[PDB]
Amino acid sequence: GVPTYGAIILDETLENVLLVQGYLAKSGWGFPKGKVNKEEAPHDCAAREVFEETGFDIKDYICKDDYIELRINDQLARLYIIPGIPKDTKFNPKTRREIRNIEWFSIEKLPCHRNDMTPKSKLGLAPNKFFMAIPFIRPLRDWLSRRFG
Ligand SMILES: CC(C)c1ncc(C(=O)NCc2ccc(F)cc2)[nH]1
Numbered sequence: 383g384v385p386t387y388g389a390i391i392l393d394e395t396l397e398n399v400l401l402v403q404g405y406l407a408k409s410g411w412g413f414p415k416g417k418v419n420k421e422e423a424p425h426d427c428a429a430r431e432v433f434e435e436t437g438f439d440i441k442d443y444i445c446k447d448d449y450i451e452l453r454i455n456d457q458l459a460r461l462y463i464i465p466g467i468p469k470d471t472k473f474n475p476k477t478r479r480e481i482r483n484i485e486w487f488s489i490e491k492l493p494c495h496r497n498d499m500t501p502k503s504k505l506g507l508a509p510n511k512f513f514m515a516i517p518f519i520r521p522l523r524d525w526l527s528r529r530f531g
Pocket residue numbers: 402403404405407408409410411412413414415416435480481511513514
């Protein structure tokens with residue numbers, strides 16, 4: 383699988399993260415990210431995808447060692463952590479054919495796992511519109527604890 387790169391953008395309080403909502407298969411909420419182009423550096427892919435999806439240019443704020451990286455079904459997804467971005471920043475996708483909406487969400491209210499269906503004696507997980515964000519939420523909480531406290 384081709385690696386993806388993007389960003390976890392936080393506000394000035396460190397309470398809120400910026401999520402984007404796509405369409406169709408990408409219909410839920412997730413961190414802005416996308417597939418690396420051939421020969422493109424990870425930091426440049428992150429800035430490009432974030433700029434295409436939010437209108438906000440992270441290039442001056444990326445810190446090379448501040449990211450969370452997960453391998454999900456043998457695809458690497460790395461999100462650079464970008465704190466301190468004012469909540470009144472005007473975000474506007476380049477591509478409204480790809481992005482429905484862009485919103486701030488409270489970190490402490492986002493789920494860090496989906497719910498089972500054990501109330502129904504059924505296997506698996508209930509749908510959750512934060513499916514794509516979820517895997518990063520516990521690592522992000524643990525990373526903000528270590529880095530800030
Ligand atoms: C709901 C679930 C089926 C799902 N699968 C993939 C995604 C997804 O990535 N959504 C967020 C998103 C990121 C970037 C973008 F450009 C547009 C949308 N969501």
